[PDB]
Design a protein around this nucleic acid. Structure first.
Ligand SMILES: [Mg+2]
Ligand SMILES: [Mg+2]
Ligand SMILES: [Mg+2]
Ligand SMILES: [Mg+2]
Ligand SMILES: [Mg+2]
Ligand SMILES: [Mg+2]
Ligand SMILES: [Mg+2]
Ligand SMILES: [Mg+2]
Ligand SMILES: [Mg+2]
Ligand SMILES: [Mg+2]
Ligand SMILES: [Mg+2]
Ligand SMILES: [Mg+2]
Ligand SMILES: [Mg+2]
Ligand SMILES: [Mg+2]
Ligand SMILES: [Mg+2]
Ligand SMILES: [Mg+2]
Lengths: 59, 92, 59, 102
RNA sequence: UAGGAAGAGUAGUACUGCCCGUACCGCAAACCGACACAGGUAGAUGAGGAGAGAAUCCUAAGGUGAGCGAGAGAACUCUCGU
RNA sequence: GUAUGAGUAGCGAAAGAAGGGUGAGAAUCCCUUCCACCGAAUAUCUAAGGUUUCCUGAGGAAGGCUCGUCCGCUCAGGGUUAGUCGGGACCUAAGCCGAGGCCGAUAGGCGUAGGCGAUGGACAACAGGUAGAGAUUCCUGUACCAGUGCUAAUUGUUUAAC
RNA sequence: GAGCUGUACGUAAGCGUUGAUCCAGAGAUUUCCGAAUGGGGGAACCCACUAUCUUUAGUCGGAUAGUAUCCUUACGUGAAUACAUAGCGUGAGGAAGGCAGACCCAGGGAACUGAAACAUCUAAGUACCUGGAGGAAGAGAAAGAAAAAUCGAUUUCCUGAGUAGCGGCGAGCGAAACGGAAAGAGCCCAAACCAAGAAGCUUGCUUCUUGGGGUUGUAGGACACUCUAUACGGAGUUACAAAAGAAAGUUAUAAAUGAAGCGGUCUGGAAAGGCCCGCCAAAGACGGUAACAGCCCGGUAGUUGAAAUGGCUUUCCCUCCAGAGUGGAUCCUGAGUACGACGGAACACGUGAAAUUCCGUCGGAAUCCGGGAGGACCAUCUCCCAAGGCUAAAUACUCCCUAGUGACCGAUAGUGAACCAGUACCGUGAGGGAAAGGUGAAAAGCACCCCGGAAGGGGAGUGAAACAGUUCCUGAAACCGUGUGCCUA
């Protein structure tokens, strides 16, 4: 959480896009059927939400 | 709606696997996605170029689990055909 | 609206008794003639009660 | 609860009164405690994924928390438990003879 | 015609073209009659022989053998023939 | 809730027969042959309506006026592809709503501009193929309608092509 | 402070003493329909315009903001029509709808029934429709009540009293004041008059606004007189004018600590039960634990606790303010109103001898030597100043939240609903509207053998009980069977 608030509100969007790409790949692999570490979906969703909340509260 | 957001997940059955050979891939999309938003989203994600897209709406099936009845989700199925010269989405 | 704009008098309700005092429900309307007066600085045409018009208002 | 994972326990009431052991689980939702070597039961199970031979299985079964008294490693007797703040944290205290349980 | 007016068409190339319905029954066991009900349900095509004919009898393409049976051949009731 | 009527009425128009097969179990399920019925229909399409009843693999408790290895029944997986077909992004009739407005104890009634509203008007794709389910939609040939860009000449500039 | 990923068994994958799951206060996101408000519409759907940015070689596509109507207001344009008005556009505030099936104010307003028929009358200004609300609403500071003497705004309660009265004088309707209580609070305009302006110049004026004065009946005010007084003081956002900022205390929304028996002993599946002994208590409330627990658990009495937000109280702050006596020449104190005639309604009062209040139409005063009332009316007396307005408390009701209570029910009862109930089902629709609780302390929920295709059984086993086996405590009666002692063609 507090590991994020020390970033210049620009690279966090880059991390957000990267996390979105990783989440989509994980969902795609689960749909195919070759995924086992299913906790990654929740982990990435929570991370994206945290960074979105930091963006919104920055103003 | 984000490009990652429009495309939900592939549909892997016997029919879709049988059609993958002819450069046709079957996906799920947002219930509110046009036939051209999907085309541009696929071009953006998988880095190919698309010839045609065909969409179709599926209603909700009726299921029961013991004294309790409800309808499954509502799907929006799409089929992307890719041009003569471009990469092939893996699926695997 | 059928109501005098100067004094707000309208239709009311009451009985119409006969001999032997049978009660029938009637109404008392009011004299509302249509005239042209100065509702605001600019003149217009509105309802004015005859009694309220007997002295004081211009036409 | 007043009894957590890993303690030493002397049961006091039931078919299996008077014995002692450790605790291997606790279910705060149901107020039950699983104590090894206490309240052993027989399970008739078919062959399956684990235990692929079935047979009669002998395992424990949870018991209510009220049937449990803590046992002190410094003294060694069933005692009621109090609390004290040592340093800047609260610790449990054997409120029978006064020794700090931890 | 009023009006706009520095762009215009021409030929050839390649590219672009959204949303909803799209299964199935549809003179029926899936629609309207509480039913796997002798009832009702708009429109298009609707062959041959004899015939004026979409009448009538037997047939083609096509479709069915009707969701209780077998066996005796009394009275009586119903539909029929002398 | 359970009896008597009682193992009684009924089993809802119609031609079936035999030989093989599966199956614990076959008049009732699958195949073959013979026979029979409709044929301006009991045939082939498509509207309204219904809403998964459609296909594959399993099942036989309940439903099926009997039986059932079967099914429009139970369980799990699947299945509907459009610039050209029908309807919107085009148009209006009956009718409906209706800015201002007229009328009226309250509520509201009527109505102008305007807008909705097909059962009608307008408008460019045909023939084939596909053994589990889609076909003027997918695929192979050949086409047409509207628009954009780009190459090539052509043409005009306010007594002004368009 | 040690487990957790809901119901709900699970499998899988994971996270936790760097402090998870959970609990409370405050924040961000909040698709689409719905007043729905860019246009349209058959609910959750279709289709845009204007700006800004973005993508492609371009068409195609994507994000962000705005765009309904009405009322009040400012400005700009502006018709027949010359000036202007109507209209048109932009800008700023406000409204719309919901409900808590309760409470209450207004507009409108029945019949069944009773009278042993029925029309006056009652039922009833009830049910119902519509509008406006507020946490309460309505009423309220005497043109009053009352009589040999006086009171002193309004409301609610006890008596007055089923009295005085109304009444096809039938059925029936039914007061008030005096007395005793709860609660108590008073004020602000108009009018003369002073000053200012602007406008009409109705033109030496009038008429409109602003500021100041001033509001009462033993008359008051204006106007002239003196006295004190401008922050000396008083006052306040609940009326009396209104808008903010604080500090302290206190409270509401999470919690902490909290004494005393593992006592022995018999029965039992198990002790909280019996017997014999001890202890705490400001704690012997309630619930749970293998049966009935002050001393086993959560707890209770008592004592502590708030980082954040809301409520409340005292104070600071802030803001606003002339009140005494005497003359009382001249002026003022609510105009188409008060009353009256006609026709209705409410007052307990049905037009009657009918005061009192309101409505519709007509007629229509005085004005301080004046005006009104004391149940027709006149004279005398007594009391009081209408035709402008505001106002807390004592009162009514509970959709709700916290803590509790019951000589209230216990599954045909109690809500329709103890269970995925306004559900299943019925109807085109408004609408109507059920049935359905209990294994065991703990799933320990019957491994294994035999008959069968299964279902179901018979052994074995868990269990105190399997005649407790996934409608599973208890299991009555009607009803259906097998055996048999006595009688029966
Ligand atoms: Mg079809
Ligand atoms: Mg013929
Ligand atoms: Mg014929
Ligand atoms: Mg008989
Ligand atoms: Mg017979
Ligand atoms: Mg039959
Ligand atoms: Mg024939
Ligand atoms: Mg089928
Ligand atoms: Mg059967
Ligand atoms: Mg809208
Ligand atoms: Mg009567
Ligand atoms: Mg009030
Ligand atoms: Mg017991
Ligand atoms: Mg007065
Ligand atoms: Mg009940
Ligand atoms: Mg005899």
């Amino acid at each position: 959480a507090n590991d994020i608030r020390d970033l210049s509100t620009t690279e966090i969007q880059d991390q957000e896009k990267a996390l979105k790409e990783e989440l989509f790949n994980l969902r795609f692999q689960l749909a195919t059927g070759q995924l086992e570490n299913t906790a990654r979906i929740r982990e990435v969703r929570k991370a994206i939400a945290r960074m979105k909340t930091i963006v919104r509260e920055r103003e | 709606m984000d490009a990652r957001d429009i495309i939900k997940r592939p549909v892997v059955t016997e029919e879709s696997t049988s059609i993958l050979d002819d450069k046709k891939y079957t996906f799920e999309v947002d219930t509110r996605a046009t036939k051209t938003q999907v085309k541009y989203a696929i071009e953006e994600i998988f880095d190919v170029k698309v010839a045609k897209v065909n969409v179709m709406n599926y209603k909700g099936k009726l299921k029961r689990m013991g004294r309790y009845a409800g309808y499954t989700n509502k799907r929006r199925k799409a089929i992307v055909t890719v041009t003569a010269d471009s990469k092939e989405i893996q699926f695997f | 609206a059928k109501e005098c704009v100067i004094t707000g008098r309208k239709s009311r309700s009451g009985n119409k008794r006969s001999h032997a005092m049978n009660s029938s429900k009637r109404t008392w309307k009011a004299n509302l003639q249509k005239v042209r007066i100065l509702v605001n600085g600019k003149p217009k045409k509105v309802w004015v009660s005859a009694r309220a018009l007997k002295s004081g208002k211009v036409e | 609860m007043h009894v957590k994972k890993g303690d030493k326990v002397k049961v006091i009431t039931g078919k299996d009164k008077g014995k002692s052991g450790k605790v291997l689980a606790a279910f705060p939702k149901k107020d039950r405690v699983l104590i090894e070597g206490i309240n052993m039961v027989k399970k008739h199970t078919k062959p399956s994924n684990i235990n692929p031979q079935g047979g009669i299985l002998n395992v424990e079964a949870p018991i209510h928390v009220s049937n449990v008294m803590l046992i002190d490693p410094k003294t060694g007797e069933p005692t009621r438990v109090g609390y004290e703040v040592k340093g800047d944290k609260k610790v449990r205290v054997a409120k029978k003879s006064g020794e700090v349980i931890d």
